[PDB]
């Protein structure tokens, strides 16, 4: 009985060969695992960053596949202290970080051959994903400037700098991150926004719904008086689809490149 | 006049079938022992208990021909003032700010300016006009609140209610506060009712006396009439003898 913590790892585990094989059965996950439908059916033991071990053990695991974000350390230690093997994975925002989850989960689940099939499909579609983007820079000009909005604090946006999933996804789609000079997430100033002068606003489906839709995003202070705001240029995508860094990476990048290119027609 | 008739208040009934009246020009002293209604009597004459207090009052107290109950809080302030036993400022007001508050109930200004300063002289606090109240001895503070309450009753028949005003004052100022008050009472047509800790001070300074025993008034009249060993023994539970001077003074037998 395997429990997986982290949406992309759940995608990887199911991508090796479904909910249950001769070698394993997935029995639980965290709330961020919304794709595919086999993951969503799984009982959930809370958000990936906050956990109760007795509840985790209530899903009766023999092994836990845990992302780098799985926590808190107190909860993980209680689970490890219960005798369940817990294997933690790294996040490096690049093909290498993804390949280690594919092959590592296959190793942990003892399905090496299935992992070899998944990695080969992924990497070939991945080379195609590099190629489709390289065929044409979105906009037909130099890499455009993209602001990724994670969420809003009232009327103030939280934006991704470097060392973010969004920074990597933006670069992979043939564009350039409008935010420079800081790491991780931080509230956006109108000053940051005007200096960043983004050509496109990228946002998640959840973030777009949370802010109130497309028009609500563009009326945010400072958004109107920017190239993206003057052109009302918004792209929304499912958060798990866009940022998860899992086996859907070539398709996620290809989709992002398309939506950027359509927005800059 | 300020007159209560068969005044009942009450949690027991503390003060029952009280009938008494203070009239302009006359200084009544309220004698009796602690927690026997004196403080409550003054609170009733003040109106603290009849505009919108949970305690029930019966009978009525009439302030110059009209019941208390039918007098606003502002209107009253112009007809009546009270000197609560003591209090400390809690903010560094100067003495002229505090005294000036006495003219608060008179509101549409240099005459309010004027009346402040003349009342500080009269109460013997003029030298303090600029000072900060949180730096004052208990006596300087008392002279200032006396100036402030005096500034409130002027006008150019009012009722001054004294709740043990001389307490914690040195000896010279006790008598000079009570002398001032009788001069104030005489010169204006102003009515004083004063709670006092020392009966001998009530004999010395009150033209009328009320002794509060039981919950009811047990003696009333001039000092010479009320200050007797019998009245004091019943009101105070305490053996008093009587001695003369060149007014009477009381000594325990």
């Amino acid at each position: 009985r395997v429990i997986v913590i982290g949406g992309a790892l759940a995608e990887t585990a199911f991508a090796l060969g479904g909910a249950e094989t001769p070698r394993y059965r997935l029995v639980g996950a965290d709330t961020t695992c919304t794709y595919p439908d086999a993951a969503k059916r799984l009982p959930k033991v809370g958000y990936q960053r906050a956990l109760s071990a007795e509840g985790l053990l209530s899903l009766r695991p023999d092994l836990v596949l845990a992302s780098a974000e799985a926590g808190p350390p107190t909860a993980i230690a209680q689970v490890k202290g219960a005798g369940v093997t817990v294997t933690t994975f790294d996040e490096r925002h690049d093909v290498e970080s993804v390949r280690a989850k594919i092959t590592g989960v296959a190793q942990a689940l003892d399905v090496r051959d299935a992992g070899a099939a998944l990695l080969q499909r992924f990497d070939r579609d991945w080379q195609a994903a590099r190629d489709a983007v390289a065929a044409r820079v979105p906009g037909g000009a130099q890499p455009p400037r993209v602001l990724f909005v994670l969420n809003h604090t009232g009327t103030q946006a939280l934006v991704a700098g470097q060392r973010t999933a969004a920074d990597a996804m933006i670069r992979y789609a043939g564009a350039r991150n409008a935010m420079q000079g800081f790491d991780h997430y931080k509230p956006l100033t109108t000053e940051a926004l005007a200096a960043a002068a983004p050509d496109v606003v990228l946002i998640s489906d959840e973030g777009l719904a949370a802010v109130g839709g497309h028009a609500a995003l563009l009326a945010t202070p400072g958004f109107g008086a920017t190239p993206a705001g003057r052109a009302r240029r918004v792209v929304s995508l499912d958060a798990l689809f866009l940022l998860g860094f899992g086996p859907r990476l070539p398709l996620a990048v290809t989709t992002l490149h398309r939506r950027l290119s359509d927005a800059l027609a | 006049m300020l007159t209560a008739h068969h005044l009942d208040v009450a949690h027991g009934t503390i003060l029952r079938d009280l009938s008494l009246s203070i009239e302009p020009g006359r200084v009544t002293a309220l004698l009796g022992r602690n927690g026997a209604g004196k403080s409550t009597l003054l609170k009733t004459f003040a109106g603290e208990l009849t505009g919108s207090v949970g305690v029930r009052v019966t009978g009525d107290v009439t302030l110059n021909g009209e019941p208390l109950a039918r007098i606003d809080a502002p209107r009253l302030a112009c007809l009546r003032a009270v000197l609560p036993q003591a209090a400390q400022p809690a903010f560094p007001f100067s003495v002229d700010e505090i005294v000036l508050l006495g003219r608060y109930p008179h509101a549409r200004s240099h005459r309010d300016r004027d009346i402040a300063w003349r009342a500080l002289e009269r109460a013997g606090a003029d030298a303090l006009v600029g000072r900060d109240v949180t730096t004052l001895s208990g006596g300087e503070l008392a002279r200032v609140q006396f100036a402030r309450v005096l500034a409130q009753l002027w006008p150019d028949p009012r009722y001054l209610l004294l709740d043990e005003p001389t307490a914690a004052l040195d000896l010279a100022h006790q008598h000079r506060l009570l002398d001032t008050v009788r001069a104030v009472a005489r010169e204006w047509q102003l009515g004083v009712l004063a709670i006092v800790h020392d009966p001998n001070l009530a004999a010395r300074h009150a033209d009328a006396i009320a002794m509060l025993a039981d919950g009811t008034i047990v003696a009333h009249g001039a000092p010479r009439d009320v200050m007797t060993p019998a009245h004091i023994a019943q009101c105070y539970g305490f053996a008093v003898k009587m001695v003369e001077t060149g007014p009477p003074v009381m000594v325990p037998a």
Partner: protein, 331 residues
């Protein structure tokens, strides 16, 4: 006859000056270092096509005037609140209005949302809890000073559990966007929000400025104020409403801002006096000054990110708390 504080207009004019001054300097910065030539065709008419309108009139000017409105609001409410409790520490958030707005705002963010409904979640939240705290403490009709603080903190516990419960079930977009609002920020300033607020605060200051003399009679004693014929219960009510309004309006869009209601009215009181006729104006002038002065370092000290000005007005209070420590320790 003298004698008085004659300093008082001098510390009010010089405070009026500096608030204007600081405000101009607040238009003259900062990030996206900017040239105003176009602004004149943008405000009205000038040679150059629309360009600095974009920022200076839509982005910058709303935040400065929001910083003035919030700083005069928390300063002025701080003045009448502490005049009420006779206690210099009474922050205007004792009505439960800072709690109430916080819950209102976090109940919207977690229970789908949209925009321009968040202010009114915070605002309706801020008023409803104030009335709850009142309805407990009062007894129809007189209320009592230590009770209002007791019912105040009991419900503070209630509303605060509802928050700690809400943050727990709240996903990650919820959490980071939560804390930042509870630290307070004018980063999302806009014109028809301070047109939405200003009729509240500017109404609130005027109900307050009119009860200023009854508020002076309190500070020598709630009972002698009664013998002066001030209707203390009504007074408490009028004050407690006016502040729950102005503070309820101002927290709705600014978030949790602290140490202005403690620092602003007290630095004017050691300056001159406790005279409420002159503490209300000055505490607004100073309070406005200081928030606009600390926001202009929320924007600018680390660019391009807004430190929440809560982190900054907290930086203000600590020394001026550590100051009056040193002014008080003789014997």
């Amino acid at each position: 006859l003298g004698t008085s504080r004659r300093f008082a207009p001098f510390v009010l004019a010089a405070l009026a000056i500096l608030m204007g001054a600081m405000s101009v300097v607040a238009l003259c910065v900062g990030a996206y270092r900017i040239p105003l030539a176009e602004a004149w065709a943008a405000l009205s008419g000038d040679p150059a096509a629309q360009q600095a309108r974009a920022v200076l009139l839509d982005i910058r000017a709303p935040r400065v005037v929001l910083a003035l409105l919030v700083g005069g609001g928390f300063g002025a409410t701080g003045a009448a609140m502490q005049a009420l409790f006779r206690n210099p520490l009474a922050d205007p958030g004792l009505v439960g209005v800072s709690s109430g707005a916080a819950l209102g705002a976090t109940t919207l963010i977690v229970l789908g949302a949209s925009a321009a409904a968040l202010p009114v979640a915070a605002f309706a939240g801020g008023l409803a809890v104030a009335a709850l705290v009142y309805r407990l403490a009062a007894s129809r009709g007189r209320l009592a000073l230590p009770l209002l603080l007791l019912a105040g903190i009991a419900i503070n516990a209630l509303v605060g559990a509802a928050i700690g419960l809400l943050t727990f079930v709240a996903d990650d977009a919820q959490l980071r966007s939560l804390t930042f609002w509870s630290l307070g920020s004018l980063g999302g300033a806009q014109w028809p929000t301070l047109a939405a607020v200003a009729p509240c605060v500017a109404l609130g200051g005027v109900l307050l400025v009119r009860e200023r003399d009854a508020l002076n009679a309190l500070q020598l004693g709630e009972t002698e104020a009664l013998h002066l014929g001030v209707p203390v219960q009504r007074l408490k009510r009028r004050v407690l409403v006016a502040v729950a309004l102005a503070v309820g309006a101002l927290v709705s869009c600014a978030g949790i801002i602290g140490f202005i209601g403690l620092v602003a009215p007290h630095c004017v009181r050691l300056a001159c006096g406790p005279d409420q006729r002159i503490v209300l104006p000055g505490a607004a002038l100073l309070g406005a000054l200081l928030t606009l002065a600390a926001d202009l370092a929320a924007r600018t000290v680390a660019a391009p990110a807004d430190i929440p000005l809560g982190v900054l007005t907290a930086l203000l209070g600590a020394p001026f708390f550590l100051a009056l420590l040193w002014k008080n320790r003789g014997a």
